[PDB]
Design an enzyme around this catalytic site. Sequence first.
Site, PDB file in Angstrom:
ATOM      1  N   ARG A   3      13.294  51.475  33.098  1.00 52.77           N
ATOM      2  CA  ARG A   3      12.186  51.455  34.100  1.00 52.77           C
ATOM      3  C   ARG A   3      13.012  51.145  35.476  1.00 52.77           C
ATOM      4  O   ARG A   3      13.765  50.241  35.181  1.00 52.77           O
ATOM      5  CB  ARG A   3      11.055  50.712  33.656  1.00 52.77           C
ATOM      6  N   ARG A  65       8.938  41.823  37.237  1.00 54.08           N
ATOM      7  CA  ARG A  65       8.088  43.435  36.706  1.00 54.08           C
ATOM      8  C   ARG A  65       7.617  44.242  38.217  1.00 54.08           C
ATOM      9  O   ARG A  65       8.261  42.569  39.209  1.00 54.08           O
ATOM     10  CB  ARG A  65       7.125  43.335  36.345  1.00 54.08           C
ATOM     11  N   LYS A 101       7.697  37.090  31.419  1.00 58.92           N
ATOM     12  CA  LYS A 101       7.418  38.099  32.285  1.00 58.92           C
ATOM     13  C   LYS A 101       6.686  37.365  33.298  1.00 58.92           C
ATOM     14  O   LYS A 101       5.480  37.089  33.221  1.00 58.92           O
ATOM     15  CB  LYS A 101       8.080  39.190  31.916  1.00 58.92           C
ATOM     16  N   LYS A 103       4.615  38.544  37.142  1.00 57.07           N
ATOM     17  CA  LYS A 103       4.202  40.251  38.131  1.00 57.07           C
ATOM     18  C   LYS A 103       3.245  39.974  39.384  1.00 57.07           C
ATOM     19  O   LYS A 103       2.989  38.777  38.889  1.00 57.07           O
ATOM     20  CB  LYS A 103       2.854  40.590  36.806  1.00 57.07           C
ATOM     21  N   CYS A 320      -2.991  52.118  26.833  1.00 64.14           N
ATOM     22  CA  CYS A 320      -1.413  51.916  27.326  1.00 64.14           C
ATOM     23  C   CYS A 320      -0.635  53.865  26.544  1.00 64.14           C
ATOM     24  O   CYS A 320      -1.342  54.282  25.498  1.00 64.14           O
ATOM     25  CB  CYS A 320      -1.194  51.052  26.480  1.00 64.14           C
ATOM     26  N   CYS A 326       5.902  53.201  21.542  1.00 65.20           N
ATOM     27  CA  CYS A 326       5.847  51.797  21.181  1.00 65.20           C
ATOM     28  C   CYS A 326       6.135  51.315  19.825  1.00 65.20           C
ATOM     29  O   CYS A 326       5.350  51.592  18.894  1.00 65.20           O
ATOM     30  CB  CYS A 326       4.331  51.013  22.253  1.00 65.20           C
ATOM     31  N   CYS A 365      -3.160  47.745  21.230  1.00 68.89           N
ATOM     32  CA  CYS A 365      -2.212  46.448  20.630  1.00 68.89           C
ATOM     33  C   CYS A 365      -2.334  44.859  20.848  1.00 68.89           C
ATOM     34  O   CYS A 365      -3.098  45.248  22.779  1.00 68.89           O
ATOM     35  CB  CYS A 365      -1.092  46.139  20.167  1.00 68.89           C
ATOM     36  N   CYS A 369      -1.585  46.298  27.468  1.00 68.43           N
ATOM     37  CA  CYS A 369      -0.947  46.921  28.502  1.00 68.43           C
ATOM     38  C   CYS A 369      -2.134  48.245  29.142  1.00 68.43           C
ATOM     39  O   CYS A 369      -2.065  48.232  30.441  1.00 68.43           O
ATOM     40  CB  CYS A 369       0.761  47.312  28.066  1.00 68.43           C
TER      41      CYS A 369
HETATM   42  C1  SRM Z   1       4.292  51.607  30.943  1.00 69.37           C
HETATM   43  C2  SRM Z   1       3.123  50.472  30.581  1.00 69.37           C
HETATM   44  C3  SRM Z   1       1.527  50.874  30.167  1.00 69.37           C
HETATM   45  C4  SRM Z   1       1.157  52.007  30.601  1.00 69.37           C
HETATM   46  O1  SRM Z   1       0.555  52.717  29.866  1.00 69.37           O
HETATM   47  O2  SRM Z   1       1.088  51.683  32.030  1.00 69.37           O
HETATM   48  C5  SRM Z   1       3.423  48.995  29.595  1.00 69.37           C
HETATM   49  C6  SRM Z   1       3.791  49.354  28.426  1.00 69.37           C
HETATM   50  C7  SRM Z   1       4.859  48.725  27.789  1.00 69.37           C
HETATM   51  N1  SRM Z   1       4.327  47.096  27.182  1.00 69.37           N
HETATM   52 FE1  SRM Z   1       3.329  46.531  28.927  1.00 69.37          FE
HETATM   53  N2  SRM Z   1       2.920  47.948  29.768  1.00 69.37           N
HETATM   54  C8  SRM Z   1       2.819  48.000  30.687  1.00 69.37           C
HETATM   55  C9  SRM Z   1       2.274  46.991  31.530  1.00 69.37           C
HETATM   56  C10 SRM Z   1       2.266  45.759  30.841  1.00 69.37           C
HETATM   57  C11 SRM Z   1      -0.072  44.969  31.500  1.00 69.37           C
HETATM   58  C12 SRM Z   1      -1.163  45.585  32.390  1.00 69.37           C
HETATM   59  C13 SRM Z   1      -0.181  45.110  34.121  1.00 69.37           C
HETATM   60  O3  SRM Z   1       0.483  44.814  33.908  1.00 69.37           O
HETATM   61  O4  SRM Z   1      -1.111  45.142  34.432  1.00 69.37           O
HETATM   62  C14 SRM Z   1      -0.212  43.690  30.304  1.00 69.37           C
HETATM   63  C15 SRM Z   1      -0.357  43.344  30.869  1.00 69.37           C
HETATM   64  C16 SRM Z   1      -1.076  41.943  31.769  1.00 69.37           C
HETATM   65  C17 SRM Z   1       0.182  41.002  31.192  1.00 69.37           C
HETATM   66  O5  SRM Z   1       1.347  40.956  31.716  1.00 69.37           O
HETATM   67  O6  SRM Z   1      -0.625  40.372  30.404  1.00 69.37           O
HETATM   68  C18 SRM Z   1       1.860  44.121  29.901  1.00 69.37           C
HETATM   69  C19 SRM Z   1       1.794  43.095  28.145  1.00 69.37           C
HETATM   70  C20 SRM Z   1       3.149  43.074  27.281  1.00 69.37           C
HETATM   71  C21 SRM Z   1       3.631  42.333  26.790  1.00 69.37           C
HETATM   72  C22 SRM Z   1       2.866  41.336  26.428  1.00 69.37           C
HETATM   73  C23 SRM Z   1       3.272  40.043  27.940  1.00 69.37           C
HETATM   74  C24 SRM Z   1       3.263  38.704  27.337  1.00 69.37           C
HETATM   75  O7  SRM Z   1       3.223  37.957  28.500  1.00 69.37           O
HETATM   76  O8  SRM Z   1       2.826  38.066  26.298  1.00 69.37           O
HETATM   77  C25 SRM Z   1       4.591  43.243  26.294  1.00 69.37           C
HETATM   78  C26 SRM Z   1       5.152  42.687  24.852  1.00 69.37           C
HETATM   79  C27 SRM Z   1       6.111  41.468  25.452  1.00 69.37           C
HETATM   80  O9  SRM Z   1       6.540  42.042  26.378  1.00 69.37           O
HETATM   81  O10 SRM Z   1       6.330  40.990  24.670  1.00 69.37           O
HETATM   82  C28 SRM Z   1       4.707  44.534  26.657  1.00 69.37           C
HETATM   83  C29 SRM Z   1       5.392  45.171  26.152  1.00 69.37           C
HETATM   84  C30 SRM Z   1       5.003  46.443  26.567  1.00 69.37           C
HETATM   85  C31 SRM Z   1       6.448  47.777  25.727  1.00 69.37           C
HETATM   86  C32 SRM Z   1       7.800  48.022  26.822  1.00 69.37           C
HETATM   87  C33 SRM Z   1       6.596  47.307  24.775  1.00 69.37           C
HETATM   88  C34 SRM Z   1       8.143  46.661  24.534  1.00 69.37           C
HETATM   89  O11 SRM Z   1       7.874  45.441  24.280  1.00 69.37           O
HETATM   90  O12 SRM Z   1       9.143  47.227  23.526  1.00 69.37           O
HETATM   91  C35 SRM Z   1       5.585  49.186  26.446  1.00 69.37           C
HETATM   92  C36 SRM Z   1       6.748  50.070  26.353  1.00 69.37           C
HETATM   93  C37 SRM Z   1       5.774  51.164  25.362  1.00 69.37           C
HETATM   94  C38 SRM Z   1       6.279  52.390  25.629  1.00 69.37           C
HETATM   95  O13 SRM Z   1       6.913  52.577  24.435  1.00 69.37           O
HETATM   96  O14 SRM Z   1       7.240  53.365  27.225  1.00 69.37           O
HETATM   97  N3  SRM Z   1       3.639  44.658  27.917  1.00 69.37           N
HETATM   98  N4  SRM Z   1       2.080  45.288  29.915  1.00 69.37           N
HETATM   99  C39 SRM Z   1       3.092  49.564  31.122  1.00 69.37           C
HETATM  100  C40 SRM Z   1       3.988  49.059  32.026  1.00 69.37           C
HETATM  101  C41 SRM Z   1       4.398  48.223  33.237  1.00 69.37           C
HETATM  102  C42 SRM Z   1       5.478  48.478  33.511  1.00 69.37           C
HETATM  103  O15 SRM Z   1       6.153  49.538  34.772  1.00 69.37           O
HETATM  104  O16 SRM Z   1       5.871  47.258  33.858  1.00 69.37           O
HETATM  105  S1  SF4 Z   2      -0.677  46.868  24.438  1.00 69.37           S
HETATM  106 FE1  SF4 Z   2       0.920  47.897  22.721  1.00 69.37          FE
HETATM  107  S2  SF4 Z   2       0.641  49.713  21.819  1.00 69.37           S
HETATM  108 FE2  SF4 Z   2       0.392  49.635  24.386  1.00 69.37          FE
HETATM  109  S3  SF4 Z   2       2.121  49.295  25.004  1.00 69.37           S
HETATM  110 FE3  SF4 Z   2       0.942  47.723  24.818  1.00 69.37          FE
HETATM  111  S4  SF4 Z   2       2.617  46.749  23.364  1.00 69.37           S
HETATM  112 FE4  SF4 Z   2       2.550  48.987  23.107  1.00 69.37          FE
END
Ligand code: SRM
Ligand code: SF4
Length: 456
Positions: A3, A65, A101, A103, A320, A326, A365, A369
């Site tokens: 990314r 991020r 992380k 944001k 997501c 994922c 999950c 996301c």
């Molecule tokens: C691509 C994206 C979803 C989408 O369909 O658009 C996404 C995809 C993934 N997210 Fe996310 N997240 C993305 C926005 C977010 C959001 C929403 C937002 O930021 O607007 C959240 C919820 C808000 C928040 O942070 O509280 C979010 C909270 C997480 C988390 C849990 C974070 C936490 O604080 O516990 C993880 C898992 C982790 O990092 O431990 C995570 C993890 C992941 C990972 C990178 C899985 C991993 O850790 O291996 C996912 C990749 C899946 C794949 O195969 O591509 N992602 N994720 C969004 C990418 C953003 C970016 O460009 O960086």
């Molecule tokens: S919500 Fe869960 S399943 Fe969806 S992209 Fe984020 S970590 Fe993966």
Amino acid sequence: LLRCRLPGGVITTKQWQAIDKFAGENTIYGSIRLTNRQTFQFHGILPVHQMLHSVGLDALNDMNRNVLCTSNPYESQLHAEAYEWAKKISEHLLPTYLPRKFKTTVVIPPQNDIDLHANDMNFVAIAENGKLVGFNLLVGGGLSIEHGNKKTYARTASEFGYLPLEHTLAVAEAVVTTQRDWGNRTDRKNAKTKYTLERVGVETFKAEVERRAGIKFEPIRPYEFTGRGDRIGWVKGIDDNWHLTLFIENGRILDYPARPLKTGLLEIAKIHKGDFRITANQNLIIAGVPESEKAKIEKIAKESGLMNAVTPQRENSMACVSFPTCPLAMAEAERFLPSFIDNIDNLMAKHGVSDEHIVMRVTGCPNGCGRAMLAEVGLVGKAPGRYNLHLGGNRIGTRIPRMYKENITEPEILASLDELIGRWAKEREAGEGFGDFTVRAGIIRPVLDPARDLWD
Ligand code: SRM
Ligand code: SF4
Ligand SMILES: [K+]
């Protein structure tokens, strides 16, 4: 899975062609996946830094991020400055090690398309006479939860106060450092800003930020949001410029039989004057199109199936990535959304509300996301084919939906919505949203203080 750091989602037509090439030739999936954080992802990478660095792009020790910025402001002239600021905060925040992380976003009311309540730090732009004068700061949003773990929760950001433009970077740095220092040193699942604020208190955290920044926050300046959706289609910009926002389902850019989405975007990128803007709703704006060029651009987008009309419901739904890429996915999201909305569209038609929309989101999950925890109707993957159904958020995304049903299947989700949508279609007040209605009609209790009342 790589990314790139792309503040405000602004990417040049040159950079686009470079990523289009790589995506096609060097990844298993051959797609470009626009994310809801205004950036893009490659899936199944089989040098990328050189390819990125060659067109001026860098992929993000760094717990930062992508910094978001309202992509298509009603007051078009405001974007330039707001974007400039999103970019400066981005570079400024670049390497301290954050507990979790961090944001950040730059919001331009009345649009909350960037979904501020899902973020740690938010700068809401305040303008006077078409000029940005300062920002209202909101801190502490976060959506991630753990199933059945009442010690985790989604939280909305809290208002700190107003700050003149000149103090922006000092304040940004102060919030980051205060979180770094006060963040939970023991457990990772409690190190996020939303938890620190609840532990020490907003005022306590706020006072420290003022001390570190060297400023005293002024009272919040009035602001309101009217929605979070993109402005699909043509909108008039400044000068003789127009912006064409293209709806891209799941933000998945790939050439499909009879719908060459990817090639179409390549053809447009080649003749496009200005640049593109990736939105927080996983869509794409072809920005700065001279009026004389509208027809050229439209012809290509139309041919490629990039302008296929969908319902207002589909335009306001999100999911997501989840499977197959994922590793943390519990239930399908991106791959379930399309047919799921086909089902919801039927239900909307059946109740005579086809011209309406419900902010509906599916996250694979509890990490969240897909931002289901800020939706009017949120589905949270619990296991293959099973989701927790949440109701009660609002259109603008300032309320967390409480869990209404747990670990149920699509047929069960559809049956509950069929019934609820019907009641809404018939019992709603003029211009009343679905989420608000479920709360008004007593179908679900609202979440008034997440850290304390999110869980039953
Ligand atoms: C691509 C994206 C979803 C989408 O369909 O658009 C996404 C995809 C993934 N997210 Fe996310 N997240 C993305 C926005 C977010 C959001 C929403 C937002 O930021 O607007 C959240 C919820 C808000 C928040 O942070 O509280 C979010 C909270 C997480 C988390 C849990 C974070 C936490 O604080 O516990 C993880 C898992 C982790 O990092 O431990 C995570 C993890 C992941 C990972 C990178 C899985 C991993 O850790 O291996 C996912 C990749 C899946 C794949 O195969 O591509 N992602 N994720 C969004 C990418 C953003 C970016 O460009 O960086
Ligand atoms: S919500 Fe869960 S399943 Fe969806 S992209 Fe984020 S970590 Fe993966
Ligand atoms: K989309």
